[PDB]
Amino acid sequence: GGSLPSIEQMLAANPGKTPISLLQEYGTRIGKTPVYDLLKAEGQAHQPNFTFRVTVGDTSCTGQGPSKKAAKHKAAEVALKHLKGCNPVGALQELVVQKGWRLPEYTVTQESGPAHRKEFTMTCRVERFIEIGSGTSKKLAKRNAAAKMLLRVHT
RNA sequence: UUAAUUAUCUAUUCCGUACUU
């Protein structure tokens, strides 16, 4: 167990999780709760812009990012401080089609065990070339495999 | 006609963390 909790102690004990999930764990000790408000949601489906605000007791702060996840993450990170007071897949497809080859293909060969810390290994396939990559999602794994493949097919 | 990328929402499944009964 433990005693006399503090916001300085979480940074040494579990800084690996989001400040969103971590800031509410601190809220329970002080009786406060981090309320989340979306300040902004606009832009094209290629480079949009998001804003979050978090409120903990008599204080509130904001954060921003290219996604809903990145904007909420930065805002919780700012509250904690005051409480302490190109596409490789598309580039490869454009080459593979220009070289006269058949369209690229992707297949998973491996996966991690824990679902909360999932990982993937994916193979890229071209008319003569084959390469492998990995990532925290099947979409990220093919992106990594495409990045290594761009070095193989290109000369 | 085909392939690839990105953001948001809803539903389902799995997993992790905190609080509470």
Place this chain on the structure above:
RNA sequence: GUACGGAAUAGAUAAUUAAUU
């Protein structure tokens, strides 16, 4: 019962790129 977080599947919306017609 509540809040936050990741992965997979399905549906809806939107923008972008390449090849072909």
